[PDB]
A paper describes a structure:
The Cop9 signalosome (CSN) is an eight-subunit complex that deneddylates cullins. Among the CSN MPN-containing subunits, CSN6 lacks a functional catalytic site and belongs to the MPN− class. In contrast, CSN5, also known as Jun-activatory binding protein 1 (Jab1) carries the catalytically competent MPN+/JAMM (Jab1-MPN-Mov34) motif. Here we report that CSN6 N-terminal domain containing its MPN domain can form a stable heterodimer with CSN5 catalytic domain in vitro.
The CSN6ΔC structure encompasses the typical MPN domain fold composed of a central β-sheet made of seven strands decorated by three α-helices and a small anti-parallel β-sheet in the Ins-1 region. The MPN core is extended by a C-terminal appendix (residues 192 to 208) that includes a small helical portion (α4 201 to 207). The asymmetric unit contains one CSN6ΔC molecule, but the crystallographic 2-fold symmetry operator generates an α-helix swapping-stabilised dimer, involving the C-terminal α4 helices. The same comparison of the monomeric form of human CSN6ΔC with human Rpn8ΔC and Drosophila CSN6ΔC gave rmsd values of 1.64 Å for 153 Cα pairs and 1.35 Å for 84 Cα pairs, respectively. Although not unambiguous, these NMR restraints were useful in combination with sequence conservation pattern and crystal packing information to delineate a CSN6ΔC surface potentially impacted by the addition of CSN5ΔC. The CSN6ΔC surface engaged in the binding to CSN5ΔC most likely corresponds to the region comprised between the α1/α2 helices, as delineated in Figure 2B with dotted grey line. Indeed the functional significance of this particular surface is strengthened by the facts that: (i) it is a highly conserved surface among CSN6 family members and (ii) it corresponds to the homodimer interface found in human CSN6ΔC and Rpn8ΔC crystal structures, as well as to the heterodimer interface found in budding yeast Rpn11ΔC/Rpn8ΔC. To further validate this interaction surface, we mutated two CSN6ΔC residues, H44 to an alanine and V115 to a glutamic acid, chosen for their high conservation and their positions on the putative interaction surface, and determined the effect of these mutations on the association with CSN5ΔC by ITC and activity measurements. The H44A variant showed a slight reduction in heterodimerisation compared with the WT control, whereas the V115E variant showed a significant 5-fold reduction in binding. Using this pro-Nedd8 gel shift assay, we showed that the hydrolytic activity of the CSN5ΔC,R106T/CSN6ΔC,H44A or V115E variant complexes was entirely compromised.
Author numbering: 38 to 208
Write the structure that this text describes.
Amino acid sequence: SVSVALHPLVILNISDHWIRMRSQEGRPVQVIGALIGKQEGRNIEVMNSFELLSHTVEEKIIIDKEYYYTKEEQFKQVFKELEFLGWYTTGGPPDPSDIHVHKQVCEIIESPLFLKLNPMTKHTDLPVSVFESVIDIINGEATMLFAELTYTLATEEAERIGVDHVARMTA
């Protein structure tokens, strides 16, 4: 149980990653990355994200750890006060592939957040969901599942040039 505030930039970044990869590959593809921000007590503020490299090995998605560590290192050289908080991907509801990848991310951080963005909604006006993992037992054995969390959009400073300011210009 945590409270989660999401900065608009995170949502825009993830959609951007998906749009750019779809253009590059000529088809929609799943994209994966890191969530960055701050946590104080049970309160998590998700401030930014960045793309991560993965490889498909024996038909499974493997996060490139060496890529991640270099990427994190460079990010922290600039943003000294921010921390890795979890990971994101795109698609529908959480699935067994997400579970397999989440277990890798659990090797980087204790209790990573998981954010999924659905790039194929036409109806929902914020196709983003956030999860934490839980280990449930029902017929003998530990089973990792995702529990969905409520989130809010993070309050931003008056001097920030944010989504409202820029949206006034686009249309």
